[PDB]
């Protein structure tokens, strides 16, 4: 599924984060169906 990666993309090494400042949050694994499960067809 989308929870896994192959052994060509998980082994690519190449492809500043201060911990103080405060977005994605909807690019989850089973998000769009668990959203429509609890809500309507949005």
């Amino acid at each position: 599924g989308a929870a896994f990666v192959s052994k060509q993309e998980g082994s690519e090494v190449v492809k500043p984060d201060p911990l103080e400042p405060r977005d994605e949050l909807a690019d989850h694994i089973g998000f769009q169906e668990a959203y429509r499960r609890f809500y309507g067809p949005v």
């Binding site: 990666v5 052994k7 082994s11 989850h28």
Partner: protein
């Protein structure tokens, strides 16, 4: 009457006994400067709840039926259903509204304090130094008499109207803001700060422009950013306290927080610390500005009269009761543990990594900045042995777990129970995370051979599977920037330090033609997996690597070895050998829209310059209007779901698209 009495506000005879210290700390003080901070903190918490607490993004975060690895501090803290987390956030909103107005202030403080610290401890990755502070300022203010001036509690209850507060309501609040400032100034005595490494990019902002007139930009980042933020944080609570240097100190800490309101997006931190710095002034200062206005205006303002006596203070002629001894105890005990918890890192050593302790409670803002090169998460099936590879960020809603060993043990445990929904029976999960802190060599932070599901973590034992930060390779950082400046616009470099016995298995993608590895220090042995051929390198020897194939860099030195990956992306180079060939023939078919999608983005990022400030600001208030409207309308959906029940999905769908409307 002494020299020290005019200077510190008390003499040593006020510290002669416990009774004279209770009398000093419960000395009757004007409620006015405490109750303008109560408004300005409770109004900046009303704004903070839809924006930074995540009320407007609560449906995306705490959604029911979602496979998610959560990081609470105490692992017994489970979040409620989404319908009830909208009730926690509307109780916290009524708490911040009754703390703002002063309406039922003791009830409305624990209506804000209790669901804030529930939400705060429910996610270790949302911890900042300000979201910790807002739960500290709301914790103190539960016990302070902040509804004793400018409140509707004054209008309803007549004995709370304009009445004296004890001195300890200011000595805790001034003692907190002194601890916020001064402990941040000795967290910035680290060698990464006094040498100009943390926030090295910050002087390139346009707000450091007048300092460029006298200094270089190499020295603007060293003096103004690093030594100017050291000598302000070290001496802000000394300048704000004393009367001779407060107006010099109030100007320097107003500028320091109007800069940080734009240099960083840290929520309301720059406005809470701006509303707190007048607590160091004389407590009569709201009455000294009420009297300066026209005469019939002050009936909408609070009262300018002298404060009436209160039961909460100790007066001169009175034996101090049990409440007055609980204010001289709360002042000394809490300002002791506020001085101790930024240095309590020898106790909670299980939370200790490359930086000391968990983030949020140590006042080391901007002292350590990280950059991750590579995360490789490798599961291993329990009944087969299929060595498979997970996505680097599968069920997490954050990227802070890769720095902290307590959160990696939480992620490896949560992945051990979530992966059987994807036919992995009992995984053995290995994390291979490459972090470089403050422009250092990239190295593994955790050992890549340890099974983190069965690895031993406890909060008070130093973790066995955390690699030490190689600080003897910290002299190399002047040479690494010399190599980075030696490269052209095309070639990139990845500096990597590896431990003895460990190796790095890198797959150079086929886009990276002409990549090579040059050993800077140590002794590695580069294996090419497709040819099964080794080649031992020593210090200074380069070696070209194939594109599209595997290679392994085995460290064979007894000391940690250091090397670099001087690669160039010849795919996007040959793309810009054709697109920069295409544009000159334009002013005379997969590639033509890739040119046009870059001429597309050239249109709107340039009108970022060409938009006015007044319509920028008008759009920013529209955004804010939509984040306050969605958070109000999605609350009423889930507040109807508990009272009236949950309707059909087609009628739930009509409201959420209505709530998600741009206004």
């Amino acid at each position: 009457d002494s020299r020290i009495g005019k200077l510190l506000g008390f003499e040593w005879t006020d510290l002669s006994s416990w009774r004279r210290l209770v009398t000093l700390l419960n000395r009757p003080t004007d409620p006015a400067s405490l109750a303008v901070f109560r408004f300005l903190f409770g109004f900046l918490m009303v704004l903070d709840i839809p924006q930074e607490r995540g009320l407007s993004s609560l449906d995306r975060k705490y959604l029911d039926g979602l496979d998610v690895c959560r990081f609470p501090l105490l692992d017994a803290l489970r979040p409620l259903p989404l319908d009830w987390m909208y009730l926690v956030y509307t109780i916290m909103f009524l708490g911040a509204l009754g703390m703002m107005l002063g309406l039922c202030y003791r009830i409305s403080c624990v209506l804000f304090l209790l669901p804030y610290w529930y939400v705060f401890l429910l996610d270790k990755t949302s911890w900042n130094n300000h979201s910790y502070l807002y739960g500290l300022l709301a914790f103190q203010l539960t016990f302070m008499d902040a509804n004793h001036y400018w409140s509707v509690d004054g209008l309803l209850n007549a004995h709370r109207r304009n009445a004296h507060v004890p001195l300890w309501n200011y000595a805790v609040l001034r003692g907190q803001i002194f601890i916020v400032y001064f402990i941040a100034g000795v967290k910035k005595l680290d060698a990464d700060w006094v040498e100009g490494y943390s926030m090295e990019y910050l002087s390139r902002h346009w707000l450091f422009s007048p300092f460029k007139l006298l200094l270089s930009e190499e020295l603007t980042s060293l003096l103004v950013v690093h030594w100017g933020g050291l000598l302000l944080d070290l001496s802000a609570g000394f300048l704000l306290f004393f009367d001779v240097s407060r107006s010099i100190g109030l100007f320097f800490v107003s500028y320091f927080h109007c800069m940080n309101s734009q240099l960083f997006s840290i929520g309301m931190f720059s406005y809470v610390m701006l509303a707190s710095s007048p607590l160091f002034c004389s407590p009569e200062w709201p009455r000294k500005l009420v009297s300066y206005c026209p005469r019939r205006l002050q009936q909408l303002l609070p009262l300018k009269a002298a404060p009436q006596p209160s039961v909460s203070c100790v007066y001169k002629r009175q034996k101090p009761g049990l409440r007055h001894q609980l204010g001289a105890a709360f002042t000394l005990l809490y300002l002791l543990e506020q001085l101790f918890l930024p240095y309590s890192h020898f106790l909670t050593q299980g939370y200790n990594n490359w930086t000391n302790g968990l983030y949020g409670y140590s006042w080391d803002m901007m002292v350590h900045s990280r950059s991750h090169q590579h995360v490789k998460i490798t599961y291993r099936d329990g009944r087969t042995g299929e060595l498979g590879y997970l996505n680097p960020g599968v069920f997490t809603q954050s990227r802070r777990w890769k720095d902290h060993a307590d959160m990696l043990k939480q992620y490896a445990t949560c992945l051990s129970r979530l992966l059987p929904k994807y036919n992995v029976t009992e995984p053995q999960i290995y994390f291979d995370i490459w972090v470089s802190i403050n422009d250092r060599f990239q190295q593994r932070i955790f050992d890549p051979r340890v099974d983190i599901v069965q690895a031993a973590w406890s909060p008070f034992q130093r973790t066995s599977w955390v690699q030490p930060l190689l600080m003897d390779l910290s002299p190399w950082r002047a040479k690494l920037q010399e190599i980075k400046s030696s490269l052209d616009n095309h070639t990139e470099v990845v500096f990597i330090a590896d431990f003895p016995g460990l190796h790095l298995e890198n797959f150079v993608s086929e886009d990276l033609g002409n990549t090579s590895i040059q050993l800077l220090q140590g002794e590695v042995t580069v294996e090419l997996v497709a040819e099964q051929k080794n080649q031992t390198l020593r210090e200074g020897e380069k070696m070209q690597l194939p594109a599209g194939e595997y290679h392994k860099v085995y460290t064979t030195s007894p000391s940690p070895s250091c090397y670099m990956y001087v690669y160039v992306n010849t795919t996007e180079l040959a793309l810009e050998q054709d697109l920069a060939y295409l544009q000159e023939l334009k002013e005379k078919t997969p590639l033509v829209q890739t040119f046009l999608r870059r001429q597309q983005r050239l249109q709107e990022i340039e009108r970022r310059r060409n938009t006015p400030f007044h319509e920028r600001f008008f759009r920013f208030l529209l955004r804010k209007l939509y984040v306050f409207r969605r958070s109000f309308l999605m609350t009423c959906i889930s507040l109807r779901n508990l009272i009236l029940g949950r309707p059909s999905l087609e009628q739930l769908a009509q409201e959420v698209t209505y709530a998600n409307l741009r206004p």
